[PDB]
């Protein structure tokens, strides 16, 4: 019933860092498109999205419970 | 979000077709049966009608744990342009009551 | 509507393309659209960004589907988009340049949409 | 053919019930359908015995409420057409009727 | 967001709710009630009952 007493931490939601955008496609000569890491192989994935180059961990972020290679 | 952009349409289009919406007061509805078919897993009907009601365009009754939203003329104009519909279509009703 | 001038032609796209829901605005969504075969058109605009995308967009058009158009002055196409839908293309609440758009089958295939693209393709 | 067709009546009002039964026994006997009389079944008691006081305080009191239903049924044996024709009409009050194909 | 919001309610006094507003405390089931004893009284006149005894 009574008013909240002081904490010594609280922090809400992380700011989900303000990274530079699309460098995932590499151009060195045209019409060639130098892709880096493999684009996601599931049927429900569109395979136009990239997979994470996250070495010692390899994970599709479109997936959210499944498809985690690690080598 | 607040809710997807698919599930907005499915409420605003359904309202336009019957001319009226109704729902129940719950927060544990699993897929919202009783129309909008199996694509509203949460509040969404109540939450979107309330925002619409804030800006007029609808009236709202409530009685024995059931909402009742009545579309109005102003909202018909809005929804007609918002959903890119013919300049004269109302499929909700249009006849004289005898 | 148009007479197959380049400027009024890209306007005719956006009207029925909105209904078709073909608009992949932003470079990342444009890329995913055109890396897929859903796309059929690419339009670019004046540099407000890095010198990387101007190269890359031509590279993607090369491999998959050649269709590109370049029309300068980002504010034109930036004005043409709303914040949701029609209701103000003026709008000081928000207006910002697209810098590139990709459209899927160039929206609805109907009247003058068909002719504007067919006019360009045979000469390019 | 001639089928044993049972016209069940059910109500909560003894006036409204009984006169509607009489109408169907006249109209049947008038046409010589060999109608069989009412079989009055035991009237049943819904009882509700609950507090008369919200937020209990003061002398402890209660309140008996009751609803009395009534059932009774007239058995006919005649063609199912003229029965289902005449039955559903000529009913003024809010009194229910349930027609059965056969029971005997 | 979250991966939970709920926990088993399948029996007990929390998995049934009475029709005042989703009120409780005032455990009720009788003959198909789901109807609150305070308001039951106000529906003595309304149909279901007329008091006679």
Curated annotation (Swiss-Prot), chain A:
ZnF (C4-type) ranges: 40-63
Modification after translation: Monoubiquitinated at Lys-26 and Lys-32 by RNF25 in response to ribosome collisions (ribosome stalling): ubiquitination promotes subsequent activation of RNF14, leading to EEF1A1 ubiquitination and degradation and rescue of stalled ribosomes. Deubiquitination at Lys-32 by USP16 is required for maturation of the 40S ribosomal complex.
Cross-link (Glycyl lysine isopeptide (Lys-Gly) (interchain with G-Cter in ubiquitin)): 26, 32
N6-acetyllysine modified-residue sites: 23, 32, 71
Residue ranges, annotated region (Disordered): 1-14
Subcellular location: Cytoplasm; Nucleus, Nucleolus
Self-association and partners: Part of the 40S ribosomal subunit. Part of the small subunit (SSU) processome, composed of more than 70 proteins and the RNA chaperone small nucleolar RNA (snoRNA) U3.
Role noted for this protein: Component of the 40S subunit of the ribosome. Part of the small subunit (SSU) processome, first precursor of the small eukaryotic ribosomal subunit. During the assembly of the SSU processome in the nucleolus, many ribosome biogenesis factors, an RNA chaperone and ribosomal proteins associate with the nascent pre-rRNA and work in concert to generate RNA folding, modifications, rearrangements and cleavage as well as targeted degradation of pre-ribosomal RNA by the RNA exosome.
Annotated protein name in UniProt: Small ribosomal subunit protein eS31
Native source organism of the sequence: Oryctolagus cuniculus (Rabbit)
Gene: RPS27A
From Swiss-Prot, chain C:
Protein name: Small ribosomal subunit protein eS12
Residues recorded as bearing N6-succinyllysine in the entry: 121
GO biological process: positive regulation of canonical Wnt signaling pathway; ribosomal small subunit biogenesis; translation
Cellular component terms (Gene Ontology): cytosolic ribosome; cytosolic small ribosomal subunit; Golgi apparatus; nucleolus; small-subunit processome
Compartment(s) of residence: Cytoplasm; Nucleus, Nucleolus
Record InterPro entries: Ribosomal_eL30-like_sf (IPR029064), Ribosomal_eL8/eL30/eS12/Gad45 (IPR004038), Ribosomal_eS12 (IPR000530), Ribosomal_eS12_CS (IPR047860)
Subunit details: Part of the small subunit (SSU) processome, composed of more than 70 proteins and the RNA chaperone small nucleolar RNA (snoRNA) U3. Subunit of the 40S ribosomal complex.
Gene3D superfamilies hit by this protein: 3.30.1330.30
Pfam families per UniProt: Ribosomal_L7Ae (PF01248)
Family to which this protein belongs: Belongs to the eukaryotic ribosomal protein eS12 family.
Keywords linked to the UniProt accession: Acetylation, Cytoplasm, Nucleus, Ribonucleoprotein, Ribosomal protein
One term of GO molecular function: structural constituent of ribosome
Protein task: Part of the small subunit (SSU) processome, first precursor of the small eukaryotic ribosomal subunit. During the assembly of the SSU processome in the nucleolus, many ribosome biogenesis factors, an RNA chaperone and ribosomal proteins associate with the nascent pre-rRNA and work in concert to generate RNA folding, modifications, rearrangements and cleavage as well as targeted degradation of pre-ribosomal RNA by the RNA exosome. Subunit of the 40S ribosomal complex.
Swiss-Prot record, chain D:
Keyword Cytoplasm: yes
Pfam families according to UniProt: Ribosomal_S10
Subcellular location: Cytoplasm
Molecular function in Gene Ontology: RNA binding; structural constituent of ribosome
GO CC terms: cytosolic ribosome; small ribosomal subunit
Modified sites of kind Phosphoserine: 78
Main location: cytoplasm
Single GO biological process annotation from the record: translation
InterPro entries: Ribosomal_uS10, Ribosomal_uS10_CS, Ribosomal_uS10_dom, Ribosomal_uS10_dom_sf, Ribosomal_uS10_euk/arc
Gene3D superfamilies, per the entry: Ribosomal protein S10 domain
Family: Belongs to the universal ribosomal protein uS10 family.
NCBIfam families linked to this entry: uS10_euk_arch
Assembly, per entry: Component of the 40S small ribosomal subunit.
Protein name, entry field: Small ribosomal subunit protein uS10
Taxonomic source organism: Oryctolagus cuniculus (Rabbit)
Taxonomic placement: Eukaryota, Metazoa, Chordata, Craniata, Vertebrata
Gene: RPS20
From Swiss-Prot, chain E:
Modification sites for Phosphoserine: 6
Biological-process GO terms, alphabetical: cytoplasmic translation
One Pfam family matching this protein: Ribosomal_S14
N6-acetyllysine PTM sites in chain numbering: 45
Keyword Acetylation carried by entry: yes
Gene Ontology annotations for the cellular component aspect, listed alphabetically: cytosolic ribosome; cytosolic small ribosomal subunit; rough endoplasmic reticulum
Keywords: Acetylation, Cytoplasm, Endoplasmic reticulum, Metal-binding, Methylation, Phosphoprotein, Ribonucleoprotein, Ribosomal protein, Zinc
Cofactor: Zn(2+)
Record note on cofactor: Binds 1 zinc ion per subunit.
Highest taxon, organism lineage: Eukaryota
Gene Ontology terms for molecular function: structural constituent of ribosome; zinc ion binding
Modification sites for Omega-N-methylarginine: 9
InterPro entries, per the entry: Ribosomal_uS14, Ribosomal_uS14_CS, RIbosomal_uS14_euk_arc, Ribosomal_uS14_sf
Binding site for Zn(2+): 18, 21, 36, 39
Subcellular location: Cytoplasm, Cytosol; Cytoplasm; Rough endoplasmic reticulum
Family recorded in the similarity comment: Belongs to the universal ribosomal protein uS14 family.
Known role: Component of the small ribosomal subunit. The ribosome is a large ribonucleoprotein complex responsible for the synthesis of proteins in the cell.
PANTHER family registered for this protein in UniProt: 40S RIBOSOMAL PROTEIN S29, SMALL RIBOSOMAL SUBUNIT PROTEIN US14
Subunit record text: Component of the 40S small ribosomal subunit.
Name of protein: Small ribosomal subunit protein uS14
Native organism: Oryctolagus cuniculus
UniProt lineage: Eukaryota, Metazoa, Chordata, Craniata, Vertebrata
This protein's encoding gene: RPS29
